[PDB]
Design a protein around this ligand. Structure first.
Ligand SMILES: Nc1ncnc2c1ncn2[C@@H]1O[C@H](COP(=O)(O)OP(=O)(O)OP(=O)(O)OP(=O)(O)OP(=O)(O)OC[C@H]2O[C@@H](n3cnc4c(N)ncnc43)[C@H](O)[C@@H]2O)[C@@H](O)[C@H]1O
Ligand SMILES: [Ca+2]
Ligand SMILES: [Ca+2]
Ligand SMILES: [Mg+2]
Ligand SMILES: [Zn+2]
Length: 212
């Protein structure tokens, strides 16, 4: 399966993406994760992206498309992929169509995890991420079994730098503006499927599993 996840900041892409990869083993490709790994490693690209990321702005298309094209050519994607948070502009989506023609792997589904804008700030400010594997928890909605550490590997959980009220507020503004153009682009292609992202995690995943 060649899958794309989309959704507003905090809508549950990672949470659902993780269950999809567990069940089907498709490599989980998150542009956010990739940029954060570059920033952790202090690579030139990391340092370039950081300026945009710290603001809640989109990293420019050209560099973003370039890291996805390079990633999608790697040998681990031949048995399929799960793309997460790319594309998030029509121009990214067009370039993806071209990239996927080129790698002989057309999109099976675009899954939009639809969540109400007003509930996203509380999802993000309460989010805690594992410093080792990057799985997400929430202090209320999805707590770890042991406070402060990952269930899977005991890594310390932390608050992402961009999960502050100020930066979230910009991330929502920025991505909301791109949302309908992107949903139009993909409903027009016939790949789009919508899921109600405002249910218990397992119930959102039940609905995802049905689509696949
Ligand atoms: N293509 C691109 N072009 C340009 N720039 C790009 C780019 N891709 C990335 N970037 C740059 O990188 C930045 C970061 O991008 P990115 O990391 O992709 O951030 P995002 O798209 O804002 O999504 P998040 O990872 O914050 O949320 P998610 O939807 O994965 O939610 P999660 O499952 O964690 O869940 C959220 C929380 O809610 C909880 N939760 C999950 N599901 C539920 C549920 N059903 N009910 C209640 N709580 C839930 C979780 O426990 C968690 O705490 C961008 O802002 C931009 O600067
Ligand atoms: Ca380095
Ligand atoms: Ca609303
Ligand atoms: Mg994520
Ligand atoms: Zn972990």
């Amino acid at each position: 399966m060649n899958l794309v996840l989309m959704g507003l900041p905090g809508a549950g892409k990672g949470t659902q993406g993780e269950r999809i990869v567990e069940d089907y083993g498709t490599p989980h490709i998150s542009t956010g994760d990739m940029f954060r790994a570059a920033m952790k490693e202090e690579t030139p690209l990391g340092l370039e992206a950081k300026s945009y990321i710290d603001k809640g702005e989109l990293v420019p298309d050209e560099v973003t498309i370039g890291i996805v094209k390079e990633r999608l050519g790697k040998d681990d994607c031949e048995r399929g992929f799960l793309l997460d948070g790319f594309p998030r502009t029509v121009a990214q989506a067009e370039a993806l169509e071209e990239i996927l023609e080129e790698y002989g792997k057309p999109i099976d589904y675009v899954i939009n995890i639809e969540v109400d804008k007003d509930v996203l700030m509380e999802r993000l400010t309460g989010r805690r991420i594992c410093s080792v594997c990057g799985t997400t928890y929430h202090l209320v909605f999805n707590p770890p079994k042991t406070p402060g550490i990952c269930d899977k590997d005991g890594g310390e959980l932390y608050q992402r730098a961009d999960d502050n009220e100020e930066t979230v507020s910009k991330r929502l503004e920025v991505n909301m503006k791109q949302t309908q153009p992107l949903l139009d682009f993909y409903s027009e292609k016939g790949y789009l499927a919508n899921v109600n992202g405002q249910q218990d995690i397992q119930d959102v995943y039940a609905d995802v599993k049905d689509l696949l």
